[PDB]
Symmetry: C2
Subunit: 500 residues, 2 copies
Amino acid sequence: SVDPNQYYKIRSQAIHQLKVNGEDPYPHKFHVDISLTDFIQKYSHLQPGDHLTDITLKVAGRIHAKRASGGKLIFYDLRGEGVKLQVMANSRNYKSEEEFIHINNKLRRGDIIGVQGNPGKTKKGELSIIPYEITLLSPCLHMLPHLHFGLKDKETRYRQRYLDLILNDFVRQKFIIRSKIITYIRSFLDELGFLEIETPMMNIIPGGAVAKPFITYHNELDMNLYMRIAPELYHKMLVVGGIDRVYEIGRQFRNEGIDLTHNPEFTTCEFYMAYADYHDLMEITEKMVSGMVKHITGSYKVTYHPDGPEGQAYDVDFTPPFRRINMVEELEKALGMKLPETNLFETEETRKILDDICVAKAVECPPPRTTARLLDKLVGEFLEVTCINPTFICDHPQIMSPLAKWHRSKEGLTERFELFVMKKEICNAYTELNDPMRQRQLFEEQAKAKAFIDENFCTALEYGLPPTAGWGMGIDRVAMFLTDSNNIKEVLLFPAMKPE
Amino acid sequence: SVDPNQYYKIRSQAIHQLKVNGEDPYPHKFHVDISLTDFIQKYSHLQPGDHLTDITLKVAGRIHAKRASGGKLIFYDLRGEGVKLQVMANSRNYKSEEEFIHINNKLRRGDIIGVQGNPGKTKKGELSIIPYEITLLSPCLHMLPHLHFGLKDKETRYRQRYLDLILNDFVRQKFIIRSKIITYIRSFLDELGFLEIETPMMNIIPGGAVAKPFITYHNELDMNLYMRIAPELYHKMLVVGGIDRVYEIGRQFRNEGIDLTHNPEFTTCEFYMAYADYHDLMEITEKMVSGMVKHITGSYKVTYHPDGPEGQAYDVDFTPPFRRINMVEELEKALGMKLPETNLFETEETRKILDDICVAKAVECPPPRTTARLLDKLVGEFLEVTCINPTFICDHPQIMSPLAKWHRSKEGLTERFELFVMKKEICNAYTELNDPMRQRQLFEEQAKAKFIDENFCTALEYGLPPTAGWGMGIDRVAMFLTDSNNIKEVLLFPAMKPE
């Protein structure tokens, strides 16, 4: 058999031969009279045997199958826009029989062609176009996988997305879903009077987050810049400036390991809303997420395959209202035991109480075994695994929530929630800090662990930030869950890949 | 008078004392019953003298002016959402007289306060809220500029945008316009069946563009990455994959000088459309841009100040159809002269004809004086300066358009256009190249003048349909539609040379 390299060499020669022969297989243009989708909807009503010799139309697409029948009849499987239309190339209906031979002899599977012909339906009842003229618009120089075998190797799909999209329609449907999600988010927030904003992705200071950053050098400034991890601080500065409702769906950057659940660049949505608290955002999140799912999917009911198409299937019910649980209470109810008072979560006596609880319940916790990390491990093992449907986990302790405002009624807790779906977090929200002295404390304590402080942002707080609530969502993970992908590369058009 | 640092120290102490005194001026929250804008529309019908003791409402905002009248009556100018509402704090109407004294003594200009009170209108006819209780929500610890004097120093405005927004409402309107522009573009393209996509901003190779790049090191990969200059190559790979219409409104990065018209990161919109040429995109561009202007501004007519509010004012008429000019033809018509044949633009004698023409018409052109650069200077001096209204400049010569497909009818020209507004280009479009050998040639020529995207060459070897591309600088469009002669005016947080 021919191998891929020999096929590519032979076909490049043929196309080169077409050029020198005055038949350049890359012509200036091909105006399409109608899309394949319109053609199918406009002419699906025809009866087996029909042929409209009175209507000539120009369509185009890519050849996926070429089946010769008798030598004066050829069938082409023409694909585009996720649909398919048969080209019944019948010599007697072509411009001329000599040209009919000439065009069929040059066309191969994968070629992009333009078809000018008549609508019709075969005797078997297959909607077809009877071509008067076929034009090779762009040839496929490479050998495509066997028809019906397709492209299944994930590494190849992710490194050649164009090939994945040529062969796999479900991949096209995935990225349509992803775009619909972002579009839906903008519609929802725009209708609530939020201003969609653009803030810097390059900053002079890295800031207090533990995340390892991308560093780049600015030659004109003789200075280093750091790629952003979140737009948070710029958004609140705009809230200080009087823009009460702001959101940004943008790229963030993390300089860490690349694998199936980690990409160096990713997409988040953050919004900040003056004079709201986390209960306001909870109601906002419920309506947005439930409405998104029903609008894009058709139902509140969604099935998801955490381990792959052949693995277990989980039914995820987005029917509002979402289940609401308070972290400490449900953790007590799930353990079947009373935990210490919430204002005692900083004493060492409660730390070992929790340490013992992890020992007794075989809950893994690597060092440091702090109260915060032990609680976090216990919650993930007793409360997050339970959250298959969308579930708000609420009122986290302060010792686990440094950035959030304190709870008004309950000592030691904060005004915070996390929305969990399929055991994973999909958005974070809490009432923000607006005391400039408290913000300076947090920046210094973050800096102490690093070894910077955003003095500009501290100054902005000194001018006055109103009470504000913040919200953040990972778009990629939402896209995974709504495209039934157990992998982040499935929802990234061009995922970062560890080089060959 | 007190200087700003002494004011900040005195007010910080006072707020600290409020804390230790159990009246923390940062309370958890303040629920607003109604926005200032809704309040104004709902209660502007009231009569001078009215006071609705039958309605209690909670509003909030920032104090911009505090004028005491007699000691039991104080007026506060409360601002928010770009609007303004007066608080007529009347002691007889407050919760209690001691609390009324206590709250007014702590409030200063700039403080964010919550007001619970009754709608009403004073005898002068000013819509007001009669407070039953005022709450300090966040104090302004810094001295603000004198009322009526505001913030005018551009450098200060750009380094403290929050302060610029506090003091200058026109700045708020500008960035509302900017968001409307991006939103309008998405609306237009989505309705034409375009898929809004996200393509990588980090790549392993810089690519052939002359642009100076940002380089960053990936530790886990032990490799350098380059910040993108355009998403072009990823979009066409998606068109190869069968997604015929794609667009991306995203950030690009250039590592060059920072000044009033240059920022290291900026926003463009690119889209690619299978089976279209530049005439298709010309009609698309006309409808999008004209419709955008009328939708956001209310008219096709826009006024613009290239040199500032006190300088010359230009009327820019976006009424379709836009004027269309063919570069070589109008350059001949404008020069009053016949140029050489369009297929002779590579001979040295045609280069010297043009060199002489620039000498005779005093058109500055620095070396190298190639045919391409001499034409470009002549076009900018004779054809682009005239383009005040939106004007399509079309059919550029091949010698000036390496990325564009060749024109079938006119030898030496390409299938290309540029949309010019106020003498500046705002979008470029042409019929793309899809011959994989030709793209490889272009990549090789780009590489010698310094790389080759082998992956993108392979994708073309699988087959790219005839496709047309389109690109627009959002920032420059935002400038022209917010009457800004400066890029920092349309960037929320512009890059700034270190103090």
